[PDB]
Amino acid sequence: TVINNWLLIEGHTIGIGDSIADSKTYQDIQNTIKKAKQDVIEVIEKAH
Amino acid sequence: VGIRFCQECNNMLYPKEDKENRILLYACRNCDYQQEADNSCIYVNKITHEVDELTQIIADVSQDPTLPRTEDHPCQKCGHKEAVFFQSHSARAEDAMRLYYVCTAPHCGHRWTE
Ligand SMILES: [Zn+2]
Ligand SMILES: [Zn+2]
């Protein structure tokens, strides 16, 4: 009871801004995915 | 090696030993007809299957549009750049990833492996 009635003041939500990250974080993620795909390509070429 | 057939009745030859003489011959039981054998081997069994698939794979697969093709590896006899490559299909070998290559030109049936 008491903590719901306090949450009436602060409130809670979820939205798009909660799921959008920074442009530098996006660049880091893309770079990681690129090196990972390049590594898998190298492994495939080694097996070939 | 493999089957040979009798001339008199087109049936299987199978081997018999000339008991008095110690020479092997092939005799079709459905008749009297006989052959002193050239094949001094009667049965061979390639247990480990070390054989490369070059005879099984065939030039017409070069016409498959869903196969990949690279300019990197040239053919030996003609040296046309385009050559389609694909994996093995032998189920039972010490290896399972080697690439078989076929020359892509309409008039050069040639094949290799790496
Ligand atoms: Zn016969
Ligand atoms: Zn060729």
From Swiss-Prot, chain A:
It is found in: Nucleus; Cytoplasm; Chromosome. The tandem heptapeptide repeats in the C-terminal domain (CTD) can be highly phosphorylated. The phosphorylation activates Pol II. Phosphorylation occurs mainly at residues 'Ser-2' and 'Ser-5' of the heptapeptide repeat and is mediated, at least, by CDK7 and CDK9. POLR2A associated with DNA is specifically phosphorylated at 'Ser-5' of the CTD by CDK7, promoting transcription initiation by triggering dissociation from DNA. Phosphorylated at 'Ser-2', Ser-5' and 'Ser-7' of the CTD by CDK9 (P-TEFb complex), promoting transcription elongation. It comes from the Eukaryota. It is linked to Neurodevelopmental disorder with hypotonia and variable intellectual and behavioral abnormalities: An autosomal dominant neurodevelopmental disorder characterized by profound infantile-onset hypotonia, developmental delay with poor speech, delayed walking, and impaired intellectual development. Additional variable features include feeding difficulties, dysmorphic features, and visual defects. The C-terminal domain (CTD) serves as a platform for assembly of factors that regulate transcription initiation, elongation, termination and mRNA processing. Belongs to the RNA polymerase beta' chain family. Component of the RNA polymerase II (Pol II) core complex consisting of 12 subunits: a ten-subunit catalytic core composed of POLR2A/RPB1, POLR2B/RPB2, POLR2C/RPB3, POLR2I/RPB9, POLR2J/RPB11, POLR2E/RPABC1, POLR2F/RPABC2, POLR2H/RPABC3, POLR2K/RPABC4 and POLR2L/RPABC5 and a mobile stalk composed of two subunits POLR2D/RPB4 and POLR2G/RPB7, protruding from the core and functioning primarily in transcription initiation. Part of Pol II(G) complex, in which Pol II core associates with an additional subunit POLR2M; unlike conventional Pol II, Pol II(G) functions as a transcriptional repressor. This is DNA-directed RNA polymerase II subunit RPB1. The chain holds residues 674 to 721 of 1970 of the full protein.
Curated annotation (Swiss-Prot), chain B:
It is found in: Nucleus, Nucleolus. The keyword Zinc-finger applies. Keywords: Acetylation, DNA-directed RNA polymerase, Metal-binding, Nucleus, Transcription, Zinc, Zinc-finger. Signal peptide: none annotated. One of its GO terms (biological process) is transcription initiation at RNA polymerase II promoter. One of its GO terms (molecular function) is nucleic acid binding. Gene3D superfamilies: 2.20.25.10. Belongs to the archaeal RpoM/eukaryotic RPA12/RPB9/RPC11 RNA polymerase family. Zn(2+) 2 binds at residues 75, 78, 103, 108. Core component of RNA polymerase II (Pol II), a DNA-dependent RNA polymerase which synthesizes mRNA precursors and many functional non-coding RNAs using the four ribonucleoside triphosphates as substrates. Pol II is the central component of the basal RNA polymerase II transcription machinery. It is composed of mobile elements that move relative to each other. POLR2I/RPB9 is part of the upper jaw surrounding the central large cleft and thought to grab the incoming DNA template. A zinc finger (TFIIS-type) spans 71-113. The keyword Signal does not apply. One of its GO terms (cellular component) is nucleolus. This is DNA-directed RNA polymerase II subunit RPB9. Zn(2+) 1 binds at residues 6, 9, 28, 31. Its main location: nucleus. A zinc finger (C4-type) spans 6-31. CDD domains: Zn-ribbon_RPB9. Component of the RNA polymerase II (Pol II) core complex consisting of 12 subunits: a ten-subunit catalytic core composed of POLR2A/RPB1, POLR2B/RPB2, POLR2C/RPB3, POLR2I/RPB9, POLR2J/RPB11, POLR2E/RPABC1, POLR2F/RPABC2, POLR2H/RPABC3, POLR2K/RPABC4 and POLR2L/RPABC5 and a mobile stalk composed of two subunits POLR2D/RPB4 and POLR2G/RPB7, protruding from the core and functioning primarily in transcription initiation. Part of Pol II(G) complex, in which Pol II core associates with an additional subunit POLR2M; unlike conventional Pol II, Pol II(G) functions as a transcriptional repressor. PANTHER family: DNA-DIRECTED RNA POLYMERASE, DNA-DIRECTED RNA POLYMERASE II SUBUNIT RPB9.
